[PDB]
């Protein structure tokens, strides 16, 4: 940005150095004010003009604005090219780049609307008369009765208003802190709840009277690949628009306006659409027979600029056939309003406002007008059937009208069309001749420019023989001729045509994100039947034998959108908690897997991408804990559920739990007992595939139909007793019958396309756009995942050894609770300190804290800030002195039973409590006459054989420990320290016979090793039990740990 500043300085020097000194003293404080105002007026698209300005300096200002505009535009495009390819950048760069490209798109839209106002309507009158009379003939062929205006009391207005207000309040239920303009909207919605009939009167008055509307705001959703607009509407108009949306869909569903080929429907998720499309391709009359030169053609395409090229007057003329005319005038009047972005106002006159409530109707009706242009009236009448007996989706009247025409399968998702043709030899030759008559090809150039699917192998995708390529070009030409280019436009570069012939053994398409390859049984090898996931087995309806296979993959745009979502998650700041990142990863991973259920297993690049993104997410937390890279890191830090203090991260990968990390220990009155309890369970095994889901769905709904038919005749109401065999099963879920809002949700028609079009109204992204829980039910279960996750990590006692739990002295876990969704970083680090601060995690570098015996592996400031707070004010030395004084008061009483003549407390040096190179004795006992000593043995060892080495002096030393997950065995530690400190030239002990008592604070363990005179060992066992139960300094340490961890009971 410094080069632009040097350029501005050079421009100002070239301006000021020409004028003399009496004008240098004036124009240094004259030009600089409006110099920024001219650039501001350019950026706000305001025409810059000021009187009293000379013309060469005005041309200099215009050259300055033009040069900075070119620099700014190329900088914005280069910044978008940096973040599109995946290069890392600061978040403020993307936040400014979104505004720059928002202003550029607004300048483009304001230009193209004025170009439409200047050049006139781009549609001719004859094409308008053609589509108008076509719609008239179609609606008179079906006897469609128009949608009436709701007069005074339709007796369903209350339920529709309730549904509209629920869909309006569905967005604001995420966060509990809102803005004032949002509080005003919630207040208006609550006032609409309080008085429904006044709200209905306001809606009907705005319908019959109002034609002017407040300005609609625009924002852009920041996808890394493609910008998408979100519109903001005034709430008083928004309530009326939502009620109009509900009433139009509920009337159009009853009047049967939409033919069954128009998709999405309310009864199918899009993978069921793909499955039924594959079954419809399979079940045709002799579809794979190519012995006489027949061909199959699969066209898929998209209507380019369908949303921007709708003329509003033509829309009103086509809309007045189906509703009341005031309703059509209200639907046209909302589209002609001023769009604002923060400085920029422009009116809308061409193209619809896609972010409206009722706009979900407008796209679905207008695109119906496209079906009369593409499919033809005769073939649409043969597909839909009579009005008194309509056909099903991908079904015909008879077989003769099925095979009477080549255009024999048709489907339209919102703007993507999928057509399937069956040609003979002579029809294909005639179509290729009709193509080559107008478009000759002397050099065979129609191979270059052919869109093909590179994700498949070379023998698996389309083989480009010349006849099949010419047939595909002819098919796309014949479809493109039927559409007037002023109304809609299809393009070859955005389309795809697959051909199945003698030279092409398999058929390809892309639909609903799925890459599908269909391959017949009779075009391949023998029976072998090795079962694979992502392989659908296709069978006939009549003979029920196998005919073909369907191979599923995930397309490239879904994987790129997922990788952009991972890059959005990795844009979290340093103050962001770890749990928010893990929750975003879990939401994204469920939104990937539960939609692409059976096809993730078949594609290998997505399985590599999931593991790569998961390791980047774990590395984001690894760098956040410590700056230095760890050599190892336990997965039980991550995959522990949030109830036990972990993160609850979902798994897609091959992670093996290492041995000797499933061990745990427990100390009781008989001593220290050890116990020993593998792969982390994956997500894809806990989700049902789509094929078994559809077969089981059909089976359970057939059984419900038979049980309902039996229950009607017996005067019996079905209860939970008869449907407890098939709970959770089928789609929609049987669970949706047993719900409180049956009469409320039964009036909601067309909910799936509305849920899909919520993306132009809400600023946040929407995973699970393809479903709604109140209508489908719940389509996955993850309690088994958490159960197997707790079971796979070695149990709760196996997890809690990593978690500093035994430093808190709670007897159980079940009565405990956390102080309140999210856990902070300090509490997480102090909780998982025994498994992070280990020797085999940060290799080599270790230090010691000053006033404690805590060994810090590496350096962790986020744990140091807690270990200073816990162990402040010499608590280590106070605990040591308290244990020494309590044991001295133990040895003070019961004097004659052990023949003790003098107990002596040694002068303890104030650094002795935490130095670990050497030690010294703490409590010295003098024998009255003589004491028999035993061999050096453990505290719990009872096989003691005493020697004749009678000694008088006895010494007792107290040692403290702060261990970790692998080194916390206090018995071998006390034995090693005894054998070290009794066999060295630096430690000082006045007696060769003694004992060392070791206490580990991080797990609260205690043991002893050394010599034993008679009567000393049960006394020391009971004394140390009494101390570990009743030391007040240990109680201060425990209450400080429980205060730091925020863990209560």
């Amino acid at each position: 940005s410094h080069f632009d500043l040097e350029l501005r300085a050079a421009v100002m020097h070239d301006i000021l150095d020409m004028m003399p000194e009496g004008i240098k003293q004036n124009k240094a404080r004259t030009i600089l004010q409006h110099l920024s105002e001219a650039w501001r007026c350019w950026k706000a698209n305001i025409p810059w003009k000021v009187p009293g300005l000379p013309t060469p300096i005005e041309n200099m200002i215009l050259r300055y604005v033009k040069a900075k505009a070119d620099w700014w535009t190329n900088t914005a495009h280069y910044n978008r090219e940096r973040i599109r390819r995946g290069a890392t950048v600061d978040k403020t760069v993307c936040k400014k780049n979104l505004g720059r490209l928002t202003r550029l798109y607004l300048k483009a839209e304001q230009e193209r609307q004025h170009n439409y106002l200047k050049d006139g309507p781009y549609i001719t009158a004859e094409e308008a008369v053609a589509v108008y009379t076509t719609t008239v003939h179609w609606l008179e062929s079906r006897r469609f009765s128009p949608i009436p205006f709701p007069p005074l009391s339709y007796k369903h207005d209350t339920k529709l208003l309730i549904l509209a207000l629920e869909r309006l309040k569905e967005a604001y239920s995420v966060k509990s802190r809102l803005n004032q303009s949002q509080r005003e909207e919630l207040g208006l919605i609550e006032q609409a709840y309080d008085n429904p009939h006044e709200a209905l009167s306001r809606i009907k008055r705005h319908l019959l009277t109002q034609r002017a509307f407040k300005e609609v705001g625009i924002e852009f959703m920041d996808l890394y690949s493609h910008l998408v607009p979100v519109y903001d509407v005034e709430p008083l108009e928004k309530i009326t628009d939502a009620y109009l949306d509900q009433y139009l869909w509920y009337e159009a569903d009853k009047r049967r306006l939409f033919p069954p080929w128009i998709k999405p429907a309310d009864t199918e998720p899009p993978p069921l659409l793909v499955y039924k499309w594959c079954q419809g391709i399979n079940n045709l009359q002799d579809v794979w027979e190519t012995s006489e030169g027949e061909c199959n053609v699969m066209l898929e395409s998209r209507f380019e600029k369908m949303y921007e090229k709708i003329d509003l007057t033509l829309l009103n003329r086509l809309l007045r056939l189906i509703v009341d005319h005031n309703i059509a005038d209200y639907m046209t009047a909302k589209n002609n309003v001023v769009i604002n972005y923060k400085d920029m106002n422009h009116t809308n006159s061409y193209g619809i406002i896609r972010g409206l409530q009722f706009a979900s109707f407008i796209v679905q009706y207008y695109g119906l007008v496209m079906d009369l242009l593409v499919l033809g009236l005769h073939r649409a009448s043969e597909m839909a059937g009579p009005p008194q007996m309509p056909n099903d989706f991908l079904s015909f009247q008879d077989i003769a009208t099925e095979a009477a025409h080549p255009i024999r399968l048709f489907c339209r998702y919102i703007d993507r069309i999928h057509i399937f043709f069956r040609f003979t030899a002579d029809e294909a030759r005639d179509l290729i001749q009709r193509y080559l008559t107008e478009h000759p090809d002397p050099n065979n150039e129609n191979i270059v420019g052919y869109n093909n699917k590179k994700c498949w192998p070379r023998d698996a995708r389309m083989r480009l023989m010349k006849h099949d390529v010419n047939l595909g070009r002819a098919v796309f030409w014949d479809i493109k001729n039927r559409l007037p280019r002023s109304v809609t436009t299809v393009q070859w570069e955005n389309s795809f045509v697959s051909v199945y012939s003698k030279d092409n053994p398999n058929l390809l398409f892309n639909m609903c994100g799925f890459e599908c390859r269909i391959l017949p049984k009779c075009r391949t090898s023998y029976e072998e039947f090795t079962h694979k996931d992502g392989v659908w087995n296709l069978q006939n309806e009549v003979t029920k034998e196998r005919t073909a296979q369907c191979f599923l993959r995930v397309d490239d745009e879904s994987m790129q959108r997922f990788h952009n979502r991972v890059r959005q998650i990795l844009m979290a700041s340093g103050s962001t908690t770890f749990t928010k990142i893990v929750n975003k990863w879990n939401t994204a991973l469920i939104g990937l897997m539960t939609y692409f259920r059976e096809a993730v297993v078949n594609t290998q690049e997505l399985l590599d991408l999931l593991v790569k993104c998961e390791n980047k997410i774990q590395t984001r937390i690894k760098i956040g804990l410590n700056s230095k890279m760890p050599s190892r890191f336990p997965p039980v830090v991550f995959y522990t559920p949030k109830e036990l203090g972990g993160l609850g991260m979902l798994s897609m990968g091959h992670v093996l739990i290492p041995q000797s990390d499933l061990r745990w220990s427990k100390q009781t009155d008989v001593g220290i007992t050890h116990f020993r309890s593998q792969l982390i369970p994956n997500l894809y095994r806990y989700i049902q595939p789509w094929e078994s889901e559809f077969i089981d769905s059909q089976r359970v709904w057939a059984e419900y139909a038979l049980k309902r038919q039996e229950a009607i005749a017996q005067n019996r109401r079905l209860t939970l007793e008869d449907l407890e065999d098939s709970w959770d099963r089928g789609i929609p879920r049987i669970n949706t019958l047993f719900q409180k809002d049956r009469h409320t949700l039964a009036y909601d028609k067309g909910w799936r396309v509305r849920t899909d079009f919520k993306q132009y109204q809400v600023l946040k992204q929407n995973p699970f756009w393809w479903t709604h829980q109140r209508h489908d039910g719940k389509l996955w279960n993850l309690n088994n995942y958490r159960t197997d996750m707790i079971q796979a990590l070695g149990g709760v006692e196996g997890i809690l050894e990593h978690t500093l739990f035994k430093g808190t002295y709670f007897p159980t876990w079940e009565g405990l609770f956390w102080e309140k969704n999210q856990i902070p970083n300090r509490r997480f680090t102090l909780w998982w300190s025994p498994t992070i601060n280990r020797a085999n995690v940060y290799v080599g570098f270790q230090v010691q804290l000053d006033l404690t015996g805590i060994f810090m592996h590496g350096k962790i400031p986020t744990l140091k800030i807690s270990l200073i707070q816990i162990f402040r004010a010499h608590l280590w030395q106070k605990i040591h002195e308290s244990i020494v004084m309590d044991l001295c008061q133990v040895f003070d009483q019961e004097l004659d039973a052990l023949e003790i003549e003098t107990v002596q407390k040694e002068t303890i040096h104030p650094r002795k409590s935490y130095k670990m190179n050497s030690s010294c004795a703490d409590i010295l006992l003098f024998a009255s006459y003589k004491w028999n000593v035993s061999r050096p043995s453990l505290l719990a060892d009872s096989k003691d054989v005493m020697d004749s080495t009678t000694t008088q002096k006895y010494w007792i030393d107290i040692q403290l420990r702060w261990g970790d997950y692998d080194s916390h065995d206090i018995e071998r530690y006390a034995r090693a320290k005894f054998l070290d400190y009794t066999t060295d030239n630096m430690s000082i002990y006045p007696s060769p016979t003694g004992v060392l008592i070791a206490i580990d604070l991080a797990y609260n363990l205690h043991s002893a090793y050394g010599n034993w005179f008679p009567g000393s060992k049960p006394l020391i066992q009971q004394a140390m039990a009494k101390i570990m139960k009743a030391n007040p300094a240990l109680y201060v340490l425990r209450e400080r740990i429980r205060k730091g961890l925020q863990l209560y009971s």
Binding site: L607, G653, R685, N784
Partner: peptide, 28 residues
């Protein structure tokens, strides 16, 4: 075993997709 999540390519031989997936009982 230094962390290092691995890919599932080739590491599924006897594991299907629908296996070990259970459904809930009706509540009360």
């Amino acid at each position: 075993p230094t962390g290092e999540v691995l890919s599932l390519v080739g590491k599924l031989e006897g594991t299907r997709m629908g296996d070990k997936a259970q459904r809930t009982k009706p509540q009360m």
